């Protein structure tokens, strides 16, 4: 059953194994991290007890630092409240498409995706339906395993992501993931 060993050879270490794992992880973290209520026995975010490597830990702080700030924006937060909910499968695919509809197949929009889904994950957590939570994470790994996979693989894994968040005045980063995602919410429908 040994075959020949464990982990043969294949140019490009950061294969999909280390990626797919960091896919259901990172998210699974930022999720039960900011929404992880204290004294709440029986967490709806069942999957991984805790992150082993600290590689994700640090990357997790980035989602918490920006989340606390971005989540403090009455603008973006309001827009998400103006986008009625009647089909998370249609809109999700719609908005996710608008993100990089012509931009430049960059990748930054990705980060915004995690935040955009967060609302659907946490928002549905209150509706009293933990099923949607698991159904959501599915749309992520699916898109990431059907897309970012190729690109992310050429970016050196999720490392390229953290490597990008290493510039000066971050005020430019928040204006990017927002100016791109926000726009999607602007076109979708402008009602108030």
């Amino acid at each position: 059953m040994d075959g020949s060993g464990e982990q043969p050879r294949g140019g490009g270490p950061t294969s999909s194994e280390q990626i797919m794992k960091t896919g259901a992880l990172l998210l699974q973290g930022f999720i039960q991290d900011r929404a992880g209520r204290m004294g709440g026995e029986a967490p709806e975010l069942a999957l991984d007890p805790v992150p082993q490597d600290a590689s994700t830990k640090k990357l997790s702080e980035c989602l918490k630092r920006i989340g606390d700030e971005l989540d403090s924006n009455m603008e973006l937060q309001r827009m998400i409240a103006a986008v009625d909910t009647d089909s998370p499968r249609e809109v999700f695919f719609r908005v996710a498409a608008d993100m990089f509809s012509d931009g430049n197949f960059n990748w930054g929009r990705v980060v915004a995706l995690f935040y955009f889904a967060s609302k659907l994950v946490l928002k549905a957590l209150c509706t009293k339906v933990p099923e949607l939570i698991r159904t959501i994470m599915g749309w992520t790994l699916d898109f990431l395993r059907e897309r970012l996979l190729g690109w992310i693989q050429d970016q050196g894994g999720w490392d390229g992501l953290l490597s990008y968040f290493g510039t000066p005045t971050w005020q430019t980063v928040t204006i990017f993931v927002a100016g791109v995602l926000t726009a999607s919410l602007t076109i979708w429908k402008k009602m108030g």
Binding site: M74, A81, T85, T127
Partner: peptide, 21 residues
């Protein structure tokens, strides 16, 4: 910062929709 003043009847109805799907 609190209370959305828009999630009471909007939701209660969002789910109801139809009795016994």
């Amino acid at each position: 910062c609190e209370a959305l003043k828009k999630a009471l009847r909007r939701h209660r109805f969002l789910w109801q929709r139809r009795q016994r799907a």
